[PDB]
């Protein structure tokens, strides 16, 4: 086969981090060459074993999940850190293998007249379990006064947008972070390079 990296990496519409898209990929072949030959990517790091080594060292079942975050908060995306995106939005595990691929899409996402399509979760009553999204947009009650679904006092709305325009500085530019995560099982290496 071929693995849909032209359908993931050249995709037209990434969701936000409160409802990030996840694509289980297996039973195809890896095009890991042009990943490095792309070289238009801001923050491109890997784990497990070296990025030059991963061309052939291949995988049972990969999880390709992607979202869009801010140009400042992307350092929060690292396996085992803190900050809002890794606290309540999307959680890398304690022991992780995959690569974090990060670049700017300022010419697409941030629009004049304002981009407010994108969102994120700013609060939750616990830190987030690893790789589990949170689409539950109910009201959290920080203080003890029960708001019970409607908004009110001591309680806030869960979600918030980002503010994207091309009037933003370089630190406030939207990154289309796609994260590749890997594993190994009794299952064979169903996705494997040349």
């Amino acid at each position: 086969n071929l693995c849909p990296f032209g359908e993931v990496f050249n995709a037209t519409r990434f969701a936000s981090v409160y409802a990030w898209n996840r694509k289980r990929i297996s039973n195809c072949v890896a095009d890991y060459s042009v990943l490095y030959n792309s070289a238009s990517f801001s923050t491109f790091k890997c784990y497990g074993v070296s990025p030059t080594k991963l061309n052939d060292l291949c995988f049972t079942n990969v999880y390709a999940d992607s979202f869009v975050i801010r140009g400042d908060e992307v350092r929060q995306i690292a396996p085992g850190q803190t900050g809002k995106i890794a606290d309540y939005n999307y959680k890398l595990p304690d022991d992780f293998t995959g690569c974090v691929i990060a670049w700017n899409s300022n010419n697409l996402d941030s629009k004049v007249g304002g981009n407010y399509n994108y969102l994120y979760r700013l609060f939750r009553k616990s830190n987030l379990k690893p790789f589990e999204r949170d689409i539950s947009t109910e009201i959290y009650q920080a203080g003890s006064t029960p708001c019970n679904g409607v908004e009110g006092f001591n309680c806030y709305f869960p979600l918030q947008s980002y503010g994207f325009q091309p009037t933003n500085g370089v630190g406030y530019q939207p990154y289309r972070v796609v994260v590749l995560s890997f594993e190994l099982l009794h299952a064979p290496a169903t996705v494997c390079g040349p």
Epitope: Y116, L122, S136, T137, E138, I139, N148, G149, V150, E151, G152, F153, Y156, F157, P158, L159, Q160, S161
Partner: antibody, heavy 118, light 108 residues
Framework: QQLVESGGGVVQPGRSLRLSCAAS????????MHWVRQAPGKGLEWVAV????????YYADSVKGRFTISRDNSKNTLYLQMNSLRAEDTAVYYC????????????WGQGTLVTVSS | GDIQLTQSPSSLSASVGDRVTITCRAS??????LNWYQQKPGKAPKLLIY???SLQSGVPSRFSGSGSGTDFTLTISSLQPEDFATYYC?????????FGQGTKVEIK
């Protein structure tokens, strides 16, 4: 982005009239939604909430007429039936949203006239 | 009981380039949960300030909010010929929500 309302009209008192208001651009589903009232020359008076993210319905006890509120979430639409009418409720209604320190989602319908008269 | 609002003054006929302070007072101590609206009569209420201290898209800093607790302030500055309309404050502290009676800024 946009809110549309069911048709207003002249209804005799004591009757009922279901109020439909459909959303567009972004869903009703993730948010709450409200109804408010404007009588001519009178201030904007809040009426009732809806809270889809759990399920709960709060009404103003100032006008406590069991004006029932529920959803059609899959059409991004909301239904409040005008029950136990009385003539001073003759006004225009709006579909509403409140920026509760977090969002900026205050979007308002076009406004339709409910009339309570024989 | 309910939470009473006190919007003062309920009208103020004004002139070009003014700096009008439309006050919305509260019966209780509300943290910042108060808003402001533009309504020319027959329009939709265009939100002006959220959480009583924060501006809004499309609305420049000719409007400017501040206050907390009971006392809330609409700081209209450099009063523009389009800004003459009927305005409103707003609680979101408890249920029920009430709105102010309105303040019509109008040409002298």
């Amino acid at each position: 982005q946009q809110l549309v309302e069911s048709g207003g009209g002249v209804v005799q008192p004591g009757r009922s009239l279901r109020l439909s208001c459909a959303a567009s651009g972004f869903t009703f589903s993730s948010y709450a939604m409200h109804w408010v009232r404007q009588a001519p020359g009178k201030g904007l008076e809040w009426v009732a909430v809806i809270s889809y993210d759990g399920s709960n319905k709060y009404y103003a006890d100032s006008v406590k007429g069991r004006f029932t509120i529920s959803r059609d979430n899959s059409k991004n639409t909301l239904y409040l039936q005008m029950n136990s009418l009385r003539a001073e409720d003759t006004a225009v209604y709006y579909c509403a949203r409140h920026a509760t320190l977090m969002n900026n989602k205050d979007i308002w319908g076009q406004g339709t006239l409910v009339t309570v008269s024989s | 009981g309910d939470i009473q609002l006190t919007q003062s003054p309920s009208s103020l006929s004004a002139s070009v380039g003014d700096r009008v302070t439309i006050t919305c007072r509260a019966s209780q101590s509300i943290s910042s949960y108060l808003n402001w609206y533009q309504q020319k009569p027959g329009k939709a209420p265009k939100l002006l300030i959220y959480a009583a201290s924060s501006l809004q898209s499309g609305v420049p800093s000719r409007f400017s909010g501040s206050g907390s607790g009971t006392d809330f302030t609409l700081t209209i500055s450099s009063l523009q010929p389009e800004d003459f309309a009927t305005y409103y404050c707003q609680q979101s502290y408890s249920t029920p929500r009430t709105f102010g009676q309105g303040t019509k800024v109008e040409i002298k």
